[PDB]
Paper text:
Here, a high-throughput approach to determine room-temperature damage-free structures with excellent sample and time efficiency is demonstrated, allowing complexes to be characterized rapidly and without prohibitive sample requirements. We have applied this approach to crystals of two heme peroxidase enzymes: a multifunctional dehaloperoxidase from the marine annelid Amphitrite ornata and a dye-decolourizing peroxidase of industrial relevance from Streptomyces lividans (DtpAa). We also examine the challenging case of detecting nitrite binding to copper nitrite reductase from Achromobacter cycloclastes, where the ligand displaces a water molecule bound in the active site. Our results cover several different ligand-binding scenarios, such as coordinate-bond formation to a heme iron (imidazole) or copper (nitrite) and noncoordinate ligand binding in a pocket (DHP ligands), with the latter being highly relevant to the binding of ligands to pharmacologically important proteins such as cytochromes P450.
Importantly, we used AcNiR–nitrite as a very challenging case to test the limitations of our approach as the nitrite ligand contains only three atoms and also displaces a water molecule upon binding. In addition, the water density in the native structure is disordered, with the presence of a second water molecule a possibility. Notably, refinement of AcNiR data and subsets versus the native AcNiR SFX structure produced clear positive difference map features for the nitrite atoms that are separated from the water molecule present in the native structure. Coot successfully located nitrite binding at the type 2 Cu active site in subsets of very few crystals, with 200 being the lowest number of crystals that were needed to successfully auto-find the nitrite ligand. Although Coot was unsuccessful at determining the ligand in the lowest crystal subset of only 100 crystals, positive electron density is still identifiable at the site where ligand binding is expected, although this did not allow for reasonable modelling of a ligand. For AcNiR, with cubic symmetry, the data remained essentially complete in all of the subset sizes analysed, with density for the nitrite ligand remaining apparent down to <200 indexed images. In AcNiR structures determined from single crystals, distinguishing between the electron-density features of active-site waters and nitrite is challenging and requires high-resolution data.
Author numbering:
A (entry chain A), B (entry chain A), C (entry chain A): 8 to 340
Write the structure that this text describes.
Amino acid sequence: DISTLPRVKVDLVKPPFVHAHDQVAKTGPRVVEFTMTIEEKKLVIDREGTEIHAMTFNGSVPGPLMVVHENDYVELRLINPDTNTLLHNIDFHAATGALGGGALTQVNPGEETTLRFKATKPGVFVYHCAPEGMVPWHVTSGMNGAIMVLPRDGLKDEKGQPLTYDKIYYVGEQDFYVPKDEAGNYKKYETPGEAYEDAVKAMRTLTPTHIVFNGAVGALTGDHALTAAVGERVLVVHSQANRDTRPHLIGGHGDYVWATGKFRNPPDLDQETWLIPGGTAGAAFYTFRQPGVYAYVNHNLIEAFELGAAGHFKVTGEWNDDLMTSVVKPASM
Amino acid sequence: DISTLPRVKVDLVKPPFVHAHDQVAKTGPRVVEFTMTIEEKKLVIDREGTEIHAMTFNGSVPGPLMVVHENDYVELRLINPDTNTLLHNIDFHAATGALGGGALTQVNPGEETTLRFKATKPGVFVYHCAPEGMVPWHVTSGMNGAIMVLPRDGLKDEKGQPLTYDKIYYVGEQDFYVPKDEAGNYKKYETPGEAYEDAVKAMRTLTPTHIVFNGAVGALTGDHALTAAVGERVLVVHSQANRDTRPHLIGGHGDYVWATGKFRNPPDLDQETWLIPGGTAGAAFYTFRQPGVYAYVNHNLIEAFELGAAGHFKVTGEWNDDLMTSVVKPASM
Amino acid sequence: DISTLPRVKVDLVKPPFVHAHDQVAKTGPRVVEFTMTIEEKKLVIDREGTEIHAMTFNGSVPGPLMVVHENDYVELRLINPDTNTLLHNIDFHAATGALGGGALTQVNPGEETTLRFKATKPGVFVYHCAPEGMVPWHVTSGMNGAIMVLPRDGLKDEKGQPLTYDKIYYVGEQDFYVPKDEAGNYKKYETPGEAYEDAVKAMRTLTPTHIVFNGAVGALTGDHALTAAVGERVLVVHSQANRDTRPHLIGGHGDYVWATGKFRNPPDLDQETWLIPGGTAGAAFYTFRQPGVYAYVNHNLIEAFELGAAGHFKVTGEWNDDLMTSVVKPASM
Ligand SMILES: O=N[O-]
Ligand SMILES: O=N[O-]
Ligand SMILES: O=N[O-]
Ligand SMILES: [Cu+2]
Ligand SMILES: [Cu+2]
Ligand SMILES: [Cu+2]
Ligand SMILES: [Cu+2]
Ligand SMILES: [Cu+2]
Ligand SMILES: [Cu+2]
């Protein structure tokens, strides 16, 4: 009887950060209430000023990470304000039935809906918009995010022993297909609807023009680098709603990796690089052992360094010369 | 001594259906006899009437699924009628030696051959045509299928316990590279040989024009949807002879997944999406828990909804409001 | 205290061969000393005479395979002779900190450096050049290789039992992006620097012009086929620093496969084809059971047979008619 379960409302936070939560569940099953507002908005995605009409959950690309525990009920209030122009909905890969909820959550501008589903399988899952007849357009305009369903007793390693993270970050990776003129310059449009016919032709080339973390080239660099300290245990959740990616921590590893993101499976150990298939969320666990700057990249290095799929970690702490040292610094022969 | 083993002839059925078989072997090892006839034929692959010269095993794209048990002998009679125009052969990824049998089964039009091999490894495997110097042309013209080698005691879960399916379907996914004129219209040809020079240039772009299930856009939709009922256990075998795919059941999961298709390995649990590498067959096991329409897609959603890699399941039964319910139906604010 | 550990200098050998080593460690941890010399050189990569300016470690594409054991120290002396024209460095995916060593090993022409790192995780790992601002250019010009970190007690199967190989081969797979004129002919350049601006535009198409084993179309065919005998146990190490690949032994299998290359994980059994993500090294173990010619391919068959990713094994021994036999040789009906 759901009417008698505890309820908690959770306010979401913008990626790459994650709303507060417990790793090991301290309560029994609950109804966890979320609210998301759809926002169509102009987004500048690179240094040259290329702009697109993004379709977002809660104003960000990716949408925010939701965190619940196995056999909680997720109750999502989805709002499509009348300032938007398109029909939207939501499909949870975590949910069972009605096309992940997409068949029940179709909202025109000016409408809202509330969906409830039981989170019966633990793991990280993609959620995304999927309206009849324009599914890839909405997904590749940034309308996707992820939900994490933790086991009620938290994460465990390949031997059943507890894994506790000190920090969690959510990296949503987005392939964009910006239409081009004949010389190769990017086009701009006044409304999403104006872009639609060109967007379909741009998608059919299967060649992204940009592949970005957190909605823009360089979004997770500089002042916006992810932070940690030597000795801290970090969980990196990574989603790609449409296209394969192969994350890699330059200078580190994935100590424990759920490449396809499902926690009833044992993790893969000591990964240098792992494949997250398009339409999947994965998670990697790493304990930092050296300070300094790390890059976190899609290890198709063209996609990383030419098309935008690269971010930074800045890690504080003491350098360990046993793990690595420069014996002879670069010098002339 | 093979001369003293029992023999059974099996008549194949057209995909997505699968010929009758036992999951748990009731006999000892047998010689299982199959006959396949090669057919080159014109195929209409989309709604706009695009036609190609398909090269098929037994008249279908994909070729039919063969089912045997571990350490059976597969005896294939391969017939190339004199109405065809090209040399053909067959390479079983399930077989050991002679390029999977391709070096022993080269038949010109008007010829036949009989190959026997021992099915020493359990799993689902690709088979495909592979003639010297024109391997990708034949494969990407649809000349590929799959063979399933069940363990003699049937499928088992990650804990060694029996898994029994009530229904099995075979989805063969095909990337096509149809040559285009300079405006982007598809070309048509009178014979396969006329197409050859353009086909090689179309393949070298590495960009498919169509990606389809069961040989055509929409082949597994509408009246041809796959069917099941709530409570039924379904095994979906999926093959891709040439290109990576990432299947996903919209509204469901892969409860047990052998993404690279080899049954001596434990399955991956609770997958939302899984990667089947080009040149591989995989299998997913799911128990339907909600009725309604499901879509089964390659979760590069451009490949699914723009290029053709999408099919339907229609599932009967009672809706379970505990798993999912619309609390507030879409309404105006 | 490193000053008191034994030291051994190892001279590297050209791929596909591997320098002599012990599978089970016979000594305690050691400092293993390697020397590599960078060589920028013109390379002919196909039958039509297409030439590129390769950037190599030790004069080969890929760079040589280094073999050490877990918790050895790797001490690399890296030399950039003054006959080269570009800055180079090295990033070991096996190493922890300083961008895998890339931040510590930047050498201009005429400089050298010596890096030491502890090999704390067993597996096969990529190493590659990665200079600030031109990472994919150097990697896709061939400046990548692999290092194998064996467990001190050797390789083990999925049940913990010893796996011993008789032969080991290293196949480095390289995607090249050769710039083209408007008719599609490949361009040639006098120096690497002349090529740079066109190379970036060629890479951004994400479409390789060539995909080769051991630096050239046909490099591992003919007289340069890999060799083995029936009954021999062969380990094939395969790396791809930039792009996914899906290796397949035509006529064989991967009996034990570490597709993402990390030996603390149990191997996948009986693979027909396996996915090595871009930026990863994998390893497959196979016992040959039939003599004859085998092809070893990337099983995107367009990439294999049109773009160059195919090599040969020639295996001696006695044919086993129990595994495969031609019952009726190809004959006219
Ligand atoms: O080592 N990451 O390119
Ligand atoms: O949720 N399948 O797009
Ligand atoms: O069976 N390898 O194409
Ligand atoms: Cu939408
Ligand atoms: Cu989806
Ligand atoms: Cu054929
Ligand atoms: Cu094959
Ligand atoms: Cu370099
Ligand atoms: Cu790297």
